[PDB]
Amino acid sequence: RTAFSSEQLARLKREFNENRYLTERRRQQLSSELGLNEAQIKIWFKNKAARPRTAFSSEQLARLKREFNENRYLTERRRQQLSSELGLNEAQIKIWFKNKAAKIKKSG
DNA sequence: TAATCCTAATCC
């Protein structure tokens, strides 16, 4: 019976742009964090969109691999630049570096 | 076809 607040709407829009896939745990987390029902979160995501893995292109992979080899530390500015030039969100760039570091640690 | 490999994305 209550409208989403400005902060609730803004957060939902950010979440959906970052990742439109709602797992059970993510629906529960967002429900708790936002103070909205799971049904409300689920309906809002379904309306907006009416395990998704990105297929990183050869061009995206070549750039990420080169950037990691040049510098393993990812500044916010470079994260933003790579998000812009590669068409990936900042979280995806951060996770790519994290996964690549973990793969290296698993080897040597 | 089924085993096996790579790694993006989740959950913590």
Add this chain to the structure above:
DNA sequence: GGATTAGGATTA
């Protein structure tokens, strides 16, 4: 950042 799963492609 650690642990692990899961898309999905490759290999045998």
